[PDB]
Amino acid sequence: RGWFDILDDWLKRDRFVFVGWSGILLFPCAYLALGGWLTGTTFVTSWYTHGLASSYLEGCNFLTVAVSTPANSMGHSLLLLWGPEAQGDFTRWCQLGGLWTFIALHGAFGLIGFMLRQFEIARLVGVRPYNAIAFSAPIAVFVSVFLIYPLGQSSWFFAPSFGVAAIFRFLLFFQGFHNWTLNPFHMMGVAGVLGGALLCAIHGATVENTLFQDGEGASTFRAFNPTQAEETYSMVTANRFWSQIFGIAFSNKRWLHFFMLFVPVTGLWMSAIGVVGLALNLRSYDFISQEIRAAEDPEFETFYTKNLLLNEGIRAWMAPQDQPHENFVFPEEVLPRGNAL
Amino acid sequence: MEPNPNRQPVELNRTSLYLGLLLILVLALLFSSYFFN
Amino acid sequence: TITPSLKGFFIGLLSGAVVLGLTFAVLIAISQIDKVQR
Amino acid sequence: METITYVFIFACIIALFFFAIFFREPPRIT
Amino acid sequence: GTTGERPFSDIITSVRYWVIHSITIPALFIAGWLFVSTGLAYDVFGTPRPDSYYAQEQRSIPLVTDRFEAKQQVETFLEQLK
Amino acid sequence: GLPWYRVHTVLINDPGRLIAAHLMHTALVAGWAGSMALYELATFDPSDPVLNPMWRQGMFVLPFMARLGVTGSWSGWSITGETGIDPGFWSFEGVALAHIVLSGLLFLAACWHWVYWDLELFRDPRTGEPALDLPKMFGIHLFLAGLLCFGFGAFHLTGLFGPGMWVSDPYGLTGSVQPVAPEWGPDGFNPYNPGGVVAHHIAAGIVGIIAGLFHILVRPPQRLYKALRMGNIETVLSSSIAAVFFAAFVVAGTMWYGSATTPIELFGPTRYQWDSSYFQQEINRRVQASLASGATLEEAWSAIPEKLAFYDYIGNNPAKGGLFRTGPMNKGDGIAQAWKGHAVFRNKEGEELFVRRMPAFFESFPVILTDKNGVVKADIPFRRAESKYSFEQQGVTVSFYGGELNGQTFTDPPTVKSYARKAIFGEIFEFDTETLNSDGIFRTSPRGWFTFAHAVFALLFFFGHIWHGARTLFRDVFSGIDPELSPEQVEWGFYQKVGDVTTRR
Amino acid sequence: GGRIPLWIVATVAGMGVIVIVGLFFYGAYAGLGSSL
Amino acid sequence: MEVNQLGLIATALFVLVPSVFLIILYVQTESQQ
Amino acid sequence: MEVNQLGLIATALFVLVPSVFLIILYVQTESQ
Amino acid sequence: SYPIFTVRWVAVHTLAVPTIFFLGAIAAMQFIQR
Amino acid sequence: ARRTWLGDILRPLNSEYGKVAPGWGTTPLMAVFMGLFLVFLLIILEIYNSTLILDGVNVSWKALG
Amino acid sequence: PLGISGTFNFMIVFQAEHNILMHPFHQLGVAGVFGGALFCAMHGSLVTSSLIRETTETESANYGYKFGQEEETYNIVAAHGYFGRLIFQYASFNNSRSLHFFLAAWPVVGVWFTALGISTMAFNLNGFNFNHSVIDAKGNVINTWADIINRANLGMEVMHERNAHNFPLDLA
């Protein structure tokens, strides 16, 4: 009946928003990550780190605002407010990119908080912790992309910036520099995300179209009771439908729902792995055998060589403005260009 | 000395065989191009 | 000798302690008042 | 050799499809 | 069903509620408005005003290029506008 | 029956066969180390530590034996290039042999422990049930770990009773195995100070001895035993995995950034050394110093050791590789033979021009020549028709100082362009591409390959921590939730405190 | 308690959003960020 | 095309070893029943 | 030594395929 | 007998208060001219 | 179970399974060392990071001479 | 193209010619597919989390369900009571029919929109163009992340089908 147990009592009270011990970590950090993003996108520029406007105050819209990465010259500095770079000056902190580390790091501890919360509530309520397990995939993606990837590179500057259009630029950077679409770890991720959405749609559609008539209304939603024992749709008819339509069907409700966990979670883990490789520029960029042939044989052409020409265009036309700290100066005559364009 | 009490049978049903072979064949199909390179 | 960044370190370190201690003081206070009835 | 390999794997996948469909464990009720 | 907090639909259809919040909500709106209209938002955060991205005859970005002198570099650029 | 993913759970309540499986694993790992070493010895060329060091040859365990003091072959060669040495029994070959003999010995003990699984040592004396006292085992093993960590630092690393470790100068020219005195001051946390490594193992070795002794004699608090399920061996697997992926992230990071324990003569340069022109600055520093004391251009550059120039080359940058570009760096750009010399470009007005160096991000990069102020003065144009800066128009020449081409000048435009294309990679070397049938495409070094593996294994092991931790804390519902969990325990308001039935309203 | 009917609260809040977001789209064509 | 000669055996073992593992387990499941 | 490149796969499969056949036959013998 | 100040009350206002303020700042911005 | 000479000798070391110190025991002391170890790792991390700069601690390869 | 790299070629050129990423119907497509994967994992994990103990730890839990049994195999109230507490109660479904309809409708509608995106970029109604939308008091252009996107788009544009254009505008 000591203080630790009294606090435990209070943190775990059943209230509108459950708190828990995990709440101590989660709620400050989530709110601060989210406040940092909203604050930066409304008020803070990227002029000195990127040579970019990036807030509503400067004239940007919701698609173009961003909290942008620190300047390349910061290396991987934690950029603490009190550190040697900002030296406690809040304004300079904002201008050097300190809000990016702020959001990234509070965001990471919030994501931990959130998964501990899924563990905490699962234990109190008495259920198996698979929702927590599944959330490991979002965490793997976040840390590999926002933390591991820029740590292998020269600086945080090459991490994603927290913005809609900024993330689009990150997509295109990865195409032109890393040829990431060619990476089989991205391809497994594509399959898991697209396979997940498929499974989501096809499982919902099936349940809704093998419903049992359990009421008399044309709205079939009313005819369900959450404490009823009986299944609300026919697994037998669903199995026959799909067997006859597609050749094979699920027959085991448990396998079905495990597979729905398995497919998208695994795909996200796979894509995280390939990004770890790209942290080191360990790309699936080329096929050697294709290049040897093409170098010797100028009539040889595939969609593979066509895409590298596109990559080479991306790199040369975007690098000067996207990597301003490098002072790239490409005279017009060196820019790769096809005929006329 | 008694025989070991902790031994257990292992199983792989036919659906798990089909699923695993498909997984392996598709992985091979995807990665083989990178092994030949 | 205590360089400017070792100074900020302690500044950062004291602030964390403050924020953390303040937080737990409040939480322990409220938990003491609004107990569960058993 | 690489062509033969690619086609060989694809052919095995098509054969697997045939057995997965026509030689599945039959779902039996209750 | 419930955990004993007062329901939202009961709160926001209540007269006391709207008596407080018809003051608190506009006041906050006007506060944020003044935060911008006074120019204070610019100065707190360091965001360039439309006239202070470049000096009159400059077209170089004032890019931070040093880690530990970065604060001093930004201050140097800002003087080159005054 | 058991699913396939659960076959090894038959060991959870069987300590002897658990020891048997751990012995087999240890045998397999010792066996790998010996096999890997023998393969590397059979493929390693020791004849040129300057331009064909181990890390260009795809050597992976050789640098780890060298790091701790193993530097010589029974064949008479050493990795430092000294000839006619007598390493004693602890040559590369004898290190490999010992691991193979250890593996054999572990295999046999594994068989004995598998058969004689039912040892009374493993039974609890009161209940007669298999039982391991994990809290005391931890103290024992920790005390052992601390003795070994202390001894490793106190005897092996100092050279008190051992060889020391690989140390080098800041530019990786003069490395060797040396005894290292402990650094007890604050610089002992400098990752680039080797004395800190010595001090770490002595200090932490004593702390582990002291902590081990505490954990042998002091029982765990009841609160923590229950919280952490300390009667359950899977809680140990959960925490152990966490410590291991923590450890794997650290060694990936120090491999990539570099530290005193990842020297560049065993693993190759880091990408940051290319990023910051680390070696180029030192070379320029030296040439200027030679020029100040009246040396000619030819003499200043000829004094540049080829080993330093080879570091100043992007083909040795570990961030230039690819995932499926396999094998040693030599398979790509070739086996380096000679420094060609420092290329100096000048235009028709005699101004010195500077090739813009390729950055590691770019698979390909255009050829742009700048003046000392960064103004573009020549390039290789893509579109020819409106070019202003062609080599042909600007009369760009290249002259070599030092190296193989010292004192030679080239003025024919296509030859000058050919060297400018190589100059974006840094310093220019002659390569043997025939011997290995090199395909000309950059591969990563063992610094790259190690970082990739350990970063990936660390991330994967995080999921294993989550999985086994979940299984420990939720063991009671692993097979499903209670079929008699009533709806009042999950519906809102019934209990003041969530899940606590003593707080009903 | 339930004085102000809920449909009326919904309608006024609703228009209040349309107005603010309207203003935000108007500002895409005026002033900062309008290309002009 | 000039492809990595070991691509073939990598691919064959990659297919054969894990498939053989599953077949072994399937057949001995059927012989229990 | 300029040996046959297909010698490796031929040897590898020569061992593997019949060895696997026997192992399959033996395991399903023990489990009945 | 309902309470007025709750953990819920705090979570709500912790978000609603800055939101309205931010909406005011952003509405002013639509009248900035270059 | 089988008794062996070596088993008899090691027996006392695997004989207190389940034994706990009451209540919270040394938990408060454990918490103190956890806290010190965190600050200690912080310092180490921030030195590597060059967020904590110390006199005479040149976090560079050039700290080999 | 009916090929893997051909697909990527199609999607890089589509971005250069239509700025599909700045198009809201492709953004709804991403939200349809991301959300679908999210809710697939959520739903799979919540049902799996609330399976009723029917088996021992030596058998797959999947054998706790027999094809064609009448009783549900999980406890939706325990799953609702977990997820309602992870967020808050009224953000969680306890009607299984509403729930699965939501699962059906979210990705289907997202993918409708992204298909309509391609179908309407077929008639050259392209993604938002904020190229040079921010300029300063003098009139200098102030780049944003959209102008950086545009540099990438340009490099795809100028390089694609490099021998096929004789005139300065790629009008189709």
Ligand code: CLA
């Ligand atoms: C649990 C909540 C939580 C967590 C995990 C974090 C975590 C973090 N914050 Mg955030 N922060 C929080 C709440 C939190 N914050 C809150 C509530 C606020 C509002 C006040 C902020 C405001 C804030 C700002 C403004 C900044 C951070 C920053 C940081 C980072 C650096 C933290 C650090 O170095 O602390 C160091 C301190 C500790 C780790 C405390 C350890 C103390 C131990 C227990 C013992 C020490 C004893 C003590 C010193 C004795 C006093 C002696 C005295 C008498 C002399 C880190 C990612 C920085 C950042 O993101 O940089 C990019 C940053 O600039 N935070």
Ligand code: CLA
């Ligand atoms: C068919 C098209 C397709 C598909 C389906 C995918 C699918 C994927 N891509 Mg790929 N991509 C494609 C085309 C495609 N891609 C193309 C053509 C390119 C160009 C080369 C790329 C380039 C690309 C890059 C550059 C990257 C991906 C990544 C990914 C993965 C993203 C995972 C995810 O949801 O992250 C979403 C993010 C998370 C899951 C992290 C955690 C999110 C937390 C929980 C947020 C919490 C929100 C919080 C509540 C605040 C909200 C409020 C706020 C919104 C207001 C996934 C496998 C990423 C990847 O591989 O990562 C490993 C990545 O970095 N893609």
Ligand code: CLA
């Ligand atoms: C008599 C024992 C012995 C000795 C002297 C050696 C010696 C060697 N081995 Mg071999 N090895 C051995 C046994 C031994 N080995 C066994 C039993 C195995 C099977 C597991 C191996 C498996 C093995 C592999 C796989 C490899 C070697 C390699 C090597 C070489 C490099 C060693 C090295 O870098 O360690 C690295 C040191 C560490 C990893 C130690 C870190 C320990 C962590 C940080 C501590 C973890 C937490 C700790 C418990 C907490 C302590 C608390 C603290 C307060 C005290 C060296 C010649 C390498 C080589 O070149 O092979 C040819 C190599 O690649 N060994």
Ligand code: CLA
């Ligand atoms: C930590 C492990 C490690 C590391 C870092 C190295 C590092 C290295 N090795 Mg060594 N090696 C190792 C382990 C390791 N080795 C082991 C365990 C063996 C025994 C098999 C060997 C045997 C060996 C030989 C025989 C040779 C090397 C060589 C080399 C060098 C080049 C490697 C290369 O081309 O990679 C290529 C790497 C890849 C192409 C990556 C493969 C990625 C896999 C296929 C992805 C799998 C994905 C998976 C299937 C998806 C499933 C997930 C989900 C769907 C369920 C390099 C220094 C070479 C050298 O230069 O030596 C002188 C050489 O000839 N190694």
Ligand code: CLA
């Ligand atoms: C010290 C490390 C360690 C140890 C001892 C264990 C031990 C265990 N795990 Mg855990 N686990 C770990 C790490 C570890 N795991 C990690 C890193 C992960 C994340 C990938 C997991 C994820 C995991 C899951 C998800 C599950 C387990 C399960 C189990 C149990 C049954 C495993 C089994 O029978 O596999 C039998 C496996 C096979 C017959 C074939 C596996 C072959 C894989 C696919 C590839 C081959 C690996 C290669 C040959 C060698 C490894 C290379 C490299 C690691 C050195 C067992 C107690 C199971 C469990 O909880 O049972 C209750 C379970 O369901 N583990």
Ligand SMILES: C=Cc1c(C)c2cc3nc(c4c5[nH]c(cc6nc(cc1[nH]2)C(C)=C6CC)c(C)c5C(=O)[C@@H]4C(=O)OC)[C@@H](CCC(=O)OC/C=C(\C)CCC[C@H](C)CCC[C@H](C)CCCC(C)C)[C@@H]3C
């Ligand atoms: C863009 C894609 C994407 C988003 C936005 C997203 C979002 C979310 N997923 C969650 C959950 C999940 N995600 C899951 C599977 C997946 N999630 C996926 C993809 C995503 N998931 C995918 C593809 C899968 C399939 C594997 C599962 C299984 C779960 C859950 O259980 C959980 C849930 O409850 O869903 C209902 C929620 C976790 C809430 C939380 O942590 O609050 C706390 C908020 C914190 C800690 C703040 C984090 C701040 C981040 C990391 C950095 C700052 C971000 C800025 C504020 C905004 C930047 C925006 C610009 C970039 C444009 C949240 C709604």
Ligand SMILES: CC1=C(/C=C/C(C)=C/C=C/C(C)=C/C=C/C=C(C)/C=C/C=C(C)/C=C/C2=C(C)CCCC2(C)C)C(C)(C)CCC1
């Ligand atoms: C950073 C920082 C911090 C923090 C801060 C914070 C925390 C903040 C917050 C802030 C906030 C928290 C914000 C908010 C905002 C909001 C907003 C801005 C909103 C908006 C919205 C909208 C606009 C919407 C609308 C709509 C639409 C459009 C459509 C649909 C419908 C709707 C209605 C939804 C501190 C202090 C620590 C210090 C350091 C730094």
Ligand SMILES: CC1=C(/C=C/C(C)=C/C=C/C(C)=C/C=C/C=C(C)/C=C/C=C(C)/C=C/C2=C(C)CCCC2(C)C)C(C)(C)CCC1
């Ligand atoms: C008995 C005996 C003996 C003998 C011994 C021997 C002879 C040994 C051997 C051993 C060995 C010789 C071992 C080895 C092993 C190896 C291994 C163990 C390997 C492993 C592998 C793996 C694991 C891999 C994997 C992978 C792949 C394949 C791909 C990529 C990725 C990865 C890496 C994952 C003696 C005489 C001493 C004495 C008496 C007793």
Ligand SMILES: CCCCCCCCCCCCCCCCCC(=O)O
């Ligand atoms: C684990 C919880 C950590 C909480 C940390 C929150 C940090 C609180 C913010 C304190 C900011 C003060 C820094 C500004 C003063 C620095 C002046 C200087 O560098 O000399």
Ligand code: OEX
């Ligand atoms: O084809 Mn296919 O791609 Ca539609 O634009 Mn015009 O054309 Mn061609 O160029 Mn850009």
Ligand SMILES: [Cl-]
């Ligand atoms: Cl045309």
